[PDB]
């Protein structure tokens, strides 16, 4: 009616390939197609969780600026290849895979030691080449879950462990389109089609649900609306003589800060305080690394 918005439903899902999909939302009242589509596109592009390789360790190498005998790729190029491995970790938020290979031929993702939780979606992903018969490579690959893009520099380690930049987002690109919805007896309803290209490690339905959950979670606030310890020690901590202590207590100076803030001319005119006592006080202060005549703001510290 006048205030009754038809609420969209997820109607159709199309799987063109393993990394290409389409999603249909229908129906949509006028003006909501783009309003939902652009927000969903921004959220899907920015904040989708994933799994990425973050550390590598090869047996013979010490740094990424070197080469290994019998391997046709520099270690830096091997790291650049491993940066794009599409993994799926099911239970944990961290895992270590092992790769061992020997003999002439390509080394691809299918040669990673088998594991239960971890799933490889691109077995043909080439990692390197071996061009010598009695040549082998063995490596430990660290995979963990995150989101966004965390470079290696932003985040001691043993010599021989190589860091890799982490790109966690599984979404490669998003597009959307608005078409005319052929509802029973209306012609003012729209249909939203979202075209999604990913790396194969996330299901389209859970991506849509995660984006909508993030949006609705963010949309709640709108519906809602030290001094240094030496200065704190009591003045009796200092090994002052009897006369000096009596003079100080006659001036209501109980903490080290209050004594510190007093200038020498002020204490010279203190009654019953001879110059000898003042020199002794200066001595006991200078022994600990302090002096008469300092200046502190916001004193006392309310304690």
């Amino acid at each position: 009616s006048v205030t009754e918005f038809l609420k969209p439903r997820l109607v159709d899902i199309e799987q063109v390939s393993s990394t290409h999909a389409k999603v249909t939302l229908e129906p949509l009242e006028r003006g909501f197609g783009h309003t939902l589509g652009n927000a969903l596109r921004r959220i899907l592009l920015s904040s989708m969780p994933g799994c990425a390789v973050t550390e590598v360790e090869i047996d013979g190498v010490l740094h990424e600026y070197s080469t290994k005998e019998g391997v046709q790729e520099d270690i830096l190029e091997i790291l650049l290849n491993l940066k794009g491995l599409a993994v799926r970790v099911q239970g944990k938020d961290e895992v270590i895979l092992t790769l061992n290979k020997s003999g002439i031929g390509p080394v691809t993702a299918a040669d990673i030691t088998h594991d239960g939780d971890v799933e490889i979606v691109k077995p043909q992903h080439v990692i390197c080449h071996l061009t010598d018969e009695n040549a082998s490579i063995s490596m430990r690959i660290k995979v963990q879950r995150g989101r966004g893009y965390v470079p290696a520099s932003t985040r001691e380690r043993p010599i021989g462990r190589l860091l890799v930049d982490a790109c966690y987002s599984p979404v490669e690109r998003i597009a959307y389109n608005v078409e005319a919805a052929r509802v029973e007896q209306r012609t003012d309803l729209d249909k939203l089609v979202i075209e999604m290209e990913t790396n194969g490690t996330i299901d389209p339905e859970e991506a849509i649900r995660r984006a909508a959950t993030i949006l609705a979670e963010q949309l709640e606030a709108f519906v809602d609306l030290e001094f240094d310890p030496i200065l704190l020690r009591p003045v009796d901590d200092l090994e002052l003589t009897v006369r000096s202590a009596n003079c100080l207590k006659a001036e209501a100076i109980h903490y080290i800060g209050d004594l510190v803030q007093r200038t020498e001319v002020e204490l010279l005119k203190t009654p019953n305080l001879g110059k000898k006592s003042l020199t002794e006080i200066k001595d006991v202060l200078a022994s600990r690394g302090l002096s008469l005549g300092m200046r502190l703001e916001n004193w006392p510290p309310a304690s």
């Binding site: 070197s66 005998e69 520099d74 061009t131 010598d132």
Partner: protein, 100 residues
């Protein structure tokens, strides 16, 4: 590589001395990320000689401007090469084409 060039890339790349060019033709006997060993053809071999060429590539050396000089192989195992072909890509080079 430049998607739009003028055809002078190969001359500058080859005639600069930064790429390893084959002295004689033959077949790549052994290719590695740090060396190349070519088995020279029979007719180009001199008498009384085991016919092989050894090309040692330079890896991560310092230039006068504190930049990197690094050569990469661009040939496969057991494939023909003729006299004058490019075996390794120097700095700013893609398959023998200048690439800045």
């Amino acid at each position: 590589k430049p998607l739009v060039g003028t055809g002078m890339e190969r001359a500058v790349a080859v005639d600069s001395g930064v790429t390893a060019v084959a002295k004689r033709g033959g077949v790549v006997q052994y290719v590695d990320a740090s060396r190349i060993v070519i088995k020279v053809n029979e007719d180009e071999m001199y008498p009384g000689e085991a016919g092989i060429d050894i090309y040692n590539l330079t890896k991560y050396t310092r230039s006068n401007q504190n930049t990197c000089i690094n050569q990469m192989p661009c040939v496969s195992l057991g494939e023909p090469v003729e006299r004058g072909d490019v075996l390794a890509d120097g700095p700013s080079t893609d398959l023998g084409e200048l690439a800045l």
